[PDB]
Paper text:
The structure of the complex (BtuB2G2) was solved to 3.7 Å resolution by X-ray crystallography. The structure shows a typical TBDT fold for BtuB2 with an N-Terminal plug domain (pfam Domain PF07715) occluding a 22-stranded-β-barrel (pfam Domain PF00593). There is no electron density for the TonB box, suggesting that the N-terminal region is disordered despite the absence of ligand. BtuG2 is located on top of the barrel, forming an extracellular lid with a large buried interface area of 3463 Å. The linker between Cys32 and the beta propeller runs parallel to extracellular loop 2 (EL2; Ser202-Tyr239) from BtuB2 and is constrained by the BtuB2 barrel via 4 hydrogen bonds provided by EL2 and EL11 (EL: extracellular loop). The BtuG2-BtuB2 interface is stabilised by ~40 hydrogen bonds that are evenly distributed across the interface, and 6 salt bridges. Gratifyingly, based on the BtuG2-CNCbl structure, the B12 binding site of BtuG2 faces BtuB2. However, the BtuG2 lid caps BtuB2, and the BtuG2 binding site is solvent excluded and clearly inaccessible to any B12. Moreover, despite the presence of 1.5 molar equivalents of CNCbl during crystallisation, no ligand is present in the crystallised complex. Indeed, BtuB2 loop EL8 is occupying the B12 binding pocket region and would clash with the ligand.
Contrasting with Enterobacteria, members of the dominant genus Bacteroides often encode several BtuB vitamin B12 outer membrane transporters together with a conserved array of surface-exposed B12-binding lipoproteins. Here we show that the BtuB transporters from Bacteroides thetaiotaomicron form stable, pedal bin-like complexes with surface-exposed BtuG lipoprotein lids, which bind B12 with high affinities. Closing of the BtuG lid following B12 capture causes destabilisation of the bound B12 by a conserved BtuB extracellular loop, causing translocation of the vitamin to BtuB and subsequent transport. We propose that TonB-dependent, lipoprotein-assisted small molecule uptake is a general feature of Bacteroides spp. that is important for the success of this genus in colonising the human gut.
Residue numbers in the entry:
A (entry chain D): 32 to 366
B (entry chain C): 45 to 327, 331 to 491, 494 to 682
The structure:
Amino acid sequence: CMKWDYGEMEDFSVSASGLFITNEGNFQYSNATLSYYDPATCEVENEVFYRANGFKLGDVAQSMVIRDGIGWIVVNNSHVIFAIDINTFKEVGRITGFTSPRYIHFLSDEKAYVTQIWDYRIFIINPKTYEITGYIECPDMDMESGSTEQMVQYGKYVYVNCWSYQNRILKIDTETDKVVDELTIGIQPTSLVMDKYNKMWTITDGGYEGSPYGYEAPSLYRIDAETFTVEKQFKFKLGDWPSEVQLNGTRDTLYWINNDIWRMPVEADRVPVRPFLEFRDTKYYGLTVNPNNGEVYVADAIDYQQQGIVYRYSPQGKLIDEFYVGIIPGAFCWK
Amino acid sequence: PMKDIGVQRTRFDSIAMKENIALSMADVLTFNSSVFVKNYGRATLSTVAFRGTSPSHTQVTWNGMRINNPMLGMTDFSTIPSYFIDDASLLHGTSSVNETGGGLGGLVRLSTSPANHEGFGLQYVQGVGSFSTFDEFLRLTYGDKHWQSSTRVVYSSSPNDYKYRNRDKKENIYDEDKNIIGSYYPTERNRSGAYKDLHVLQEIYYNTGEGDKFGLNAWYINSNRELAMLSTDYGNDMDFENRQREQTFRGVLSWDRVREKWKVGVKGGYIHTWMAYDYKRDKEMASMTRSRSKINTFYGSADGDYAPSEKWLFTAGVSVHQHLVESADKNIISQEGNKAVVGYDKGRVEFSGSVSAKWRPVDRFAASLVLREDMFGTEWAPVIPAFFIDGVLSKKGNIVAKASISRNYRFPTLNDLYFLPGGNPDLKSEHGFTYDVGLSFSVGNVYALSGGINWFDSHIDDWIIWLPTTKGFFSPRNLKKVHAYGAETNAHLDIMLGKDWKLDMNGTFSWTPSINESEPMSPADQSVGKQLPYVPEFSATVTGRLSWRTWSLLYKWCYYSQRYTMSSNDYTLTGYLPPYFMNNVTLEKQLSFRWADLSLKGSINNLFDEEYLSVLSRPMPGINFEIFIGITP
């Protein structure tokens, strides 16, 4: 007198501008979900992947990028990346075989990179054929502590930050698919972005206390893309746990979460004394900026055990809306 | 009827713990008691949780030893076979203290005893079935008027590729240029679920004419279990590799001098666990996460009960464990090009000393006070007291009421503090204020029946709970303050409705809420006054059986209410766990020979072929069977 449930195959055509929210869920709980928020109606729909496909998304969705009307969702602990239609949410394809996929960066319609953690290789795939095509061997990296995270492209080169137990940025030549250069910076850079001045901002987390690798004050770095040299370093206070640095549509104001939500012009010579949003007893975990109107969405995971909520604030800091999403939102994707 | 003054403990029947050879040990608790057991597979991570209580407050005792390895304060119950236990009580709540402290939920009190069989009684049981599952057990015993010995050994192996219609993940039918055509729920096999387990226990015992008993038992286990790919794991089983080895030993020596009023005993033991975890992939293999962590522990214990006549009884006891850990989780390349490790290595003493006074003025009224002092590491825990009362309401039907109040403390574990990838070594001890009250009932030899109920209520102060950070790893924090009351009921009857028509029955039912009562964490905290996740509101379990001469049959059933996979307890399509109704049944026929006793039995699990879920994302097998053949003296 008990059963399992399958089905609930819903179908719906959704708006043009929207915001996707990936929900990590709990490790080995396969409760990761995808949410979709409509800024024009202030209505959010949760678990859209399961409702549209009839089966669970997987276990640890990490991030999402959209290329040509198709959204690629990386599911870290499911060894797969799902390609879905950005309008119906129905699965259009998938690529399995990944060690622990992190982020995906497209080079062309037939070539894309997928960074990984717990691997010294960056998986190369062919989005058009939905299969794994190659590997990028990272120097001075083993499987036990290998780590590649975000990627940004600069001409024929691609820069990638090495986060977990690493302290470098790699320079990859996309014409040969091999690592051709590296740069050592603070310990564990968490993210990598490119601004309108061909500058690269990255923020390190300073490791952790008692680490055999290192423990330091995390920092924000400005590195010239052309010369691949560090030009600016803004150190914060030891003990801080900032998030990955992110930029807005015009790429001239960088935002991040430290203990508050900060914002800074990329040309400034010091970190501002005033924050964008004063702390308000909310567990800031995720952050993003609307590339078209500048509205800032802050994702608070709450206790990491129940559905999280996202606050939508205007560029001036006016509360515009708030809505419950999934469990532990940590990444966003604008449509 | 003393030392159980106001004490609530569940005693297990002789054949309740020797029903089937493998049967784990969680499968005995989960069908003759009414506590919660987080469990998915056979060779699974079966954890026991008491009334609204975390498993971290359910600590166990084997022959007086603490088996919960202090690297993480609990005991895995799939690592204990049903046939490797002779005596097993289960002290509930506030009654756990007068044997050892630190048990906020309560204690499982285990001990092996000499079977007291004279001669050579080799006993072999062999069992097959289900998904290529094979189990073997053998016991060689030696009996003597003064010496005694017994050697037991269990080996069980299975691939666990059970067929499941996977309603959790779909598979596609493609065409030219990888345009998706079809999608179906596959009928897959449990990937990387195999297991190979071996146990061996050697015990000897000494007895002289006057009351001087000696005893010694050593226990080796070698476990090699494959971590099942979770249901949404889109990875090849032959590509990936997820292995858990655990080689551990537990040994105990005992000396007991008992005479009339005064009974005294001392014990000394040692455990040593070595846990190896491996997670690898193919490029010709290579390790993704490869770790080895070993802890060894020395024991010292002394208990004594001086009971001057009746109406006064006094117990005293001491248990000191010195632990010695060696953790090592990853090998990293340090900045200097060298090779370094992230594991820590620590160790601390764990002393608990207790004194109790049982006083019964008359047969009706009786009370008792137990008082414990605990000291783990370098810190003296504040006195952990408890007080029991029992009373004979009416001699007709023995209706007896008991009640007891206490204040327990639990120290954080060595992973709770010194975990180097994690952190926060300044954690506060968990505080629990608890108090119970209940009643019991019995009526009698050509017929018999008994039962009782109780009442649970506990406030837990700042208690440990691990939280993710923005850095990708967990750290603990004493944030929540839970409020877990409840109630438990039991009833066992047996009326011989004929010359030989024995009908043995018992059943239990528990209402166990564990509502959160902490600081609302965020302005959107929906879990402020909701029950904690994975804590079933209602639980129940009935086991009944009957005998017709050499033929016997028992049926077991249990129900757990909806297990909330979310702290807020709201409904969610992706994370819904339905109520859990497991039904299983076993039957045996034996037939005695000259100097031997042959038996054949068959057991089923998951009758009705219900396709269900007990832990989120972890599949469960269909209907399964095992058939056993046994020779006994």
